[PDB]
Paper text:
D. radiodurans encodes two putative HJ resolvase (HJR) homologs: RuvC (DrRuvC) and YqgF (DrYqgF). The widespread bacterial RuvC and YqgF are evolutionarily connected, and both possess a canonical RNase H-like fold, including five β-strands (β1 to β5) and three α-helices (α1 to α3). The apo structures of RuvC and YqgF from D. radiodurans (DrRuvC and DrYqgF, respectively) were determined by X-ray crystallography. To sum up, our study showed that DrRucC might act as a major HJR in D. radiodurans, while DrYqgF might play certain roles in RNA metabolism.
The refined DrRuvC model contains two monomer molecules in an asymmetric unit. Each monomer is comprised of five β-strands (β1 to β5), and these strands are sandwiched by five α-helices (α1, α2, α3a, α3b, and α3), forming a canonical Rossman fold. Interestingly, the DrRuvC homodimer exhibits distinct asymmetry in residues 73 to 83 spanning the dimer interface, which is also observed in the TtRuvC apo structure. The fourth catalytic residue of RuvC, which is also located at α3 and is usually glutamate, is replaced by histidine in DrRuvC and TtRuvC. DrRuvC could preferentially cleave HJ at the consensus 5′-(G/C)TC↓(G/C)-3′ sequence and could prefer using Mn2+ for catalysis in vitro, which would be different from the preferences of the other previously characterized RuvCs.
Numbering used by the authors:
A (entry chain B): 1 to 70, 72 to 111, 118 to 133, 135 to 155
B (entry chain A): 1 to 156
Amino acid sequence: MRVLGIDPGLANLGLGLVEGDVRRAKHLYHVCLTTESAWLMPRRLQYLHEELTRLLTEYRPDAVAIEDQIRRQADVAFKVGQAFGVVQLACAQAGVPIHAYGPMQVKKSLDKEQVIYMVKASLGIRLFNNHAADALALALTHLAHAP
Amino acid sequence: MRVLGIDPGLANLGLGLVEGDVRRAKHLYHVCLTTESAWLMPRRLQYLHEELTRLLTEYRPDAVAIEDQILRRQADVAFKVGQAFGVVQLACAQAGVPIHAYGPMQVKKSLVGTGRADKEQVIYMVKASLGIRELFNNHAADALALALTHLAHAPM
Ligand SMILES: [Mg+2]
């Protein structure tokens, strides 16, 4: 019933918490974590894991939904992959099962911003930020797919 | 003085521990961790983070040496590699242990002596420098090689 969606990244990390059924979803919480530029990789990784860990303990989600990985550049893919493993580790440390959905799949379940208005409508709020918006989108998308 | 060497991987994680300085060095510990492919990816990144944090907590390394990822031809592959690498880097930060990377160049350079990836010689010079009778596994041997390499770049 409660689900955490994560827009993964290193410079940005979008997190979104919603709760409810397939017909009805209650928005709980959303934020975009931005680790700044001039920190060593481990320091950035420490901030993302600490903050993520803090939110999984309190909100106690029952599922984590994560965006499937798409980018042709390899150094970027390695940097993005480091944040992805630290996110996958935090859930495992919390015991929260992690389901993966593709960008198209979330678009099916709800230049192009239609998606943003569908999440806003189903949670009855107002999202300026593009990263917290997709995380909520993934959280809503898990509810539809969930049996 | 005490250096942990890490050969990072998801299927295989070589960890090597060594204390001393450039002229002579003491062998403390080495192992190769594996994760079965039956586990989901998060379950594997937890085991390595767990066994790394364990060895990191007992032995309290002064520094960590890690094999540099200068492999650079597929984005899909670097992403898969990066997940393991980041869990390793986080355990070190969580332990407060500074991280130094060395290319395969420097390992062989600082061990064989003007070597050019003479892999069997590098292993050979690992057993001799640390007085180890048997070093079978290449990941633990590589991780042992990296620890000696930071010891060669030692500041004093
Ligand atoms: Mg290797």
